[PDB]
Amino acid sequence: EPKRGTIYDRNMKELAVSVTKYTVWCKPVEVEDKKEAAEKVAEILDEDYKDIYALISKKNMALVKVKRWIDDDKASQIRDAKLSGIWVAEDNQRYYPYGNFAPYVLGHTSSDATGISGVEMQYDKKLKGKPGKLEPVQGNGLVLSIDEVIQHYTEKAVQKAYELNNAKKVTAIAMNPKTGDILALASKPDYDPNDSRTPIYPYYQEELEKYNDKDKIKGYYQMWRNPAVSDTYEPGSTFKLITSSSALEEGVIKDGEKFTCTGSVTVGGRKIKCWRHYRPHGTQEFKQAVQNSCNPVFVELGSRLGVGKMYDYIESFGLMDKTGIDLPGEAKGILYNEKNVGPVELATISFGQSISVTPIQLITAISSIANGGDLMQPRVVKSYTDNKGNITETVKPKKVRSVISKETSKKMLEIAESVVTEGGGKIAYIPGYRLGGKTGTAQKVIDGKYAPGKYICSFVGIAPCDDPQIVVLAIVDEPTGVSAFGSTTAGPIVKEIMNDSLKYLGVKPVY
Amino acid sequence: IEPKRGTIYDRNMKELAVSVTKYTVWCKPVEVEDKKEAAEKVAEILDEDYKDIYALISKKNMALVKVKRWIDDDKASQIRDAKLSGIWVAEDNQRYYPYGNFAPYVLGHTSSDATGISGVEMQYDKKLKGKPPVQGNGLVLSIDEVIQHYTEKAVQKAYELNNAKKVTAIAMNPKTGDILALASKPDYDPNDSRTPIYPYYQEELEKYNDKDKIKGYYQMWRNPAVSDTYEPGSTFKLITSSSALEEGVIKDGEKFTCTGSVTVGGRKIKCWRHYRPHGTQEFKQAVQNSCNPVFVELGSRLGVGKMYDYIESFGLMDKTGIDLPGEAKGINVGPVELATISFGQSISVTPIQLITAISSIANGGDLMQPRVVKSYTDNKGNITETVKPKKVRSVISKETSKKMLEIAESVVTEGGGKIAYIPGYRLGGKTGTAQKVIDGKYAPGKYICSFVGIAPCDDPQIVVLAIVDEPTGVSAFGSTTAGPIVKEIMNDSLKYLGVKPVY
Ligand SMILES: *C(=O)[C@@H](NC(=O)[C@H](N)c1ccccc1)[C@@H]1N[C@@H](C(=O)O)C(C)(C)S1
Ligand SMILES: *C(=O)[C@@H](NC(=O)[C@H](N)c1ccccc1)[C@@H]1N[C@@H](C(=O)O)C(C)(C)S1
Ligand SMILES: [Zn+2]
Ligand SMILES: [Zn+2]
């Protein structure tokens, strides 16, 4: 079996490496004195007698693995023990040196070192070594766009929010909007790629004993599923950045136009309420309606666009199609067919309800607003290496299309900054770093229906808005026992990741 | 009449800088006998505000007033044909750069009185100036406009891709010391030398009060390739290696062992790749893997004495004497400084010093004076004199030169330079990554990445130094940032130079 190629972060830190280890094997029948062998092996390996005894006493199993991937020192003690029916064999370990880290990027391999999830699978052929015969050649390596420092800050912020919000799931993606490079992708609960079948979060512990042995592979695939690329969700008010960009690009907002909030608008015989319908926003300039997250104003902009223009921009921002991200099992969101869209559906779409997207779709779309209107193909793999760590080839950023003009982009970045300085994203304000973004709080869809007390809260951030270098999307899925708002659950995630990442990146503060 | 300057040509006699005859409208106010009637006519012809023209011709206290500068020949004979007593037109030559925003750090530009204030325009101001009208003598640059276009294109692409503070590339003919190309982004347009054409310069000029704007101008105009110093990083291992081999301190088939670190006194210098040490290495392989411990050992075997002699001999302590203005001269810790110096840290050079040093390795060991001016012409475009290639000294033997060219090729075929590999073209070179020295202190997340290429290594015809200064949002390594710049320039330039592929 040949070693797989090494997977590096963008600073050439090893994230996944094939290392030559030794495994302790046993044929029970060939073991003369089982208590004696168990005690010798147990002492060498530093394991409890009763556990090693239970392994080498096994019935009807002709060949038993006693312990995988022991170091050379302990493997030499086993050999030199000269025990019967007990031996050591060379065994390639697929080792992930940062452990419970970036599992939904890296993925993992089966027993035979075949990639079965994440980058390990997507680039299985590129990573595979060339076999030897009774010497093997290590496979070519990969350099990710992922930065282990930003990934750490992302994992840390997401793990904190998961505990604090007692959430079903917390997910964050950090993107370079200029290139579409993923800097970080974290979701909790997650798994350790060093031990892909051992749940390390109670949630997955409880989910794996709702399956019999025959069907446990289904529970494993559930735990290995990348929520950033495979799950869909109604994005809430973050989609108001899409509606705003579309409205400004189409010229449907007059300069100095005042929009009046009375707390509701009637469409299709239904009242669509402002969140603050008890205390109407009254007269608003457009900037102030985004700051206020005033639903009726977005209903009006949706109507001025109509179903056709609205669906053109949704398609153009990439929200009806896979992003083409180089990870396995991407979904493509859920949207009502354009020609069956009624007035109430159109009105809700205008503020991000009755449309489902992946997190990757939504961050990719928002990144085009932060990149002069250019939609980029997201990617995780930036470069290929030989088996000695030498770069052989690097991948160019791919511009898919211009969604909006440079002028609309600049106006939107000025509006996004004002949401964080003057509006509903104030919680995420960092002095000197010109953070912009938008919050969402959306009732959760389960089996095509809106369930009660179950929300998805999100915040998308862009920094710095004068020259965007990082976009962060954080999603808190079903926060429990807390103020369930985008600002209070997800805003602190984006603020922490932005604060730590911009200082790591050396972004100069401007006060 | 300030006479026409000499024309500046590329080496294929394409015009890069030429004086063109325009016309200026003059007034002697005490002879405009019918002022606002005379100023109504001139206002239309020149299309002026009817007031701005009157205001100028009705000046009580001036013997001569310039009405409008650099007007076209139609309007010149229109003004002559109106035969007003106090108003005429005179010739007035304008400097034009037909390629516009192209090799601005080589060409430079002039002030309104046709005096050169940067680049070749200033360095050769005397040679270019006309007789007071006889047009001045012209220059033929070593610059090739085709290779310059390949260099500008590669450097602009890298500037955008890497969101860098700056990208700089020099192409040199190692046999002659001739500069084939010198480009840097951001740069400026010598046709309009005070209007920033890059956001970066738009920002840096707005930081000065209008009164103090000159420090801003001279910052936009500064040629980073001759005036800016930097820490070369591992490209310096080509100097250290050449020096080691020339002194003979490397034994034939000697093996060097990497275990992630060395001990050069109590202080232990570690390798850059101590996570997976390189193990046992032929010298070739130490250079391919850029193994720091090996170059420390080589440094120790030379001593401070011989190291500093070789550095000086390669010209790295002295100006090159390139014929451009404002060249930087450039910038204690015992065996520890000696150790770090061995791979290009705590040592600062200009890009022109470094490419000149590497060029001597690629030219059988002959250090050459670099030059941008190959020939002089008359005022009619005939060549009168060619500047001879000037050897400064032999730094190493043809033997050491051949060994170093074999190693340089192996860096690109087998080692850290693989990104730049072109089938048939025998490229060699070395990557560098350094932390940026600012006012003497290393920063955080601030790297200068570089790649020096030599091709073909069996008969070198071109050396290219590419430097990406502060790449942003991307992996900061010589190979990924600077390697594609050299590859692109080498690919386009070797075909144009008519280098035959050998498979
Ligand atoms: C966008 O997400 C909007 N959300 C809604 O209108 C929901 N139907 C809602 C959920 C919870 C409470 C009230 C309404 C606006 N943006 C939200 C946010 O920015 O957090 C909001 C709650 C301010 S309303
Ligand atoms: C030569 O430039 C060396 N560079 C360094 O030792 C820097 N201190 C460094 C920068 C980034 C990461 C680790 C160390 C060696 N040559 C470089 C190159 O060829 O680009 C290198 C990164 C392989 S280390
Ligand atoms: Zn409202
Ligand atoms: Zn080493």
Numbering used by the authors:
A (entry chain A): 56 to 189, 209 to 585
B (entry chain B): 55 to 186, 210 to 408, 414 to 585
Sentences from the paper on this structure:
Cephalosporins are members of the β-lactam family of antibiotics. These drugs achieve their bactericidal potency by irreversibly inhibiting penicillin-binding proteins (PBPs), particularly the transpeptidase (TPase) PBPs that cross-link cell wall peptidoglycan. Four annotated TPase PBPs exist in the genome of C. difficile R20291, a hypervirulent epidemic ribotype 027 strain: PBP1 (CDR20291_0712), PBP2 (CDR20291_0985), PBP3 (CDR20291_1067), and SpoVD (CDR20291_2544). A recent study found PBP1 and PBP2 are essential for vegetative growth in R20291, while SpoVD and PBP3 are essential for sporogenesis. Remarkably, in addition to C. difficile PBP2, we find this Zn2+-binding motif is also present in C. difficile PBP3 and SpoVD, meaning three of the four TPase PBPs, and all three class B PBPs in C. difficile have this motif.
Next, we determined the structures of PBP3 and SpoVD, at 2.40 Å and 2.20 Å resolution. Both SpoVD and PBP3 possess a canonical class B PBP fold that closely resembles Pseudomonas aeruginosa and E. coli PBP329,30. Like PBP2, the four residues in the Zn2+-binding motif of C. difficile PBP3 and SpoVD consist of an invariant His, a Cys from the X residue of the SXN motif, and two electron rich residues—in this case Cys instead of Asp. Importantly, we find Zn2+ binds in an almost identical manner as PBP2, suggesting Asp and Cys are interchangeable at the first and second position. The significance of the Asp → Cys substitution between SpoVD/PBP3 and PBP2 is unclear. Whereas the redox-sensitive cysteine in the SXN motif for PBP2 can potentially function as a sensor for environmental oxygen levels, the replacement of Asp for Cys in both sporulation specific PBPs (PBP3 and SpoVD) may further enhance the sensitivity and/or subject them to additional regulation. Nonetheless, SpoVD and PBP3 are very promising drug targets.
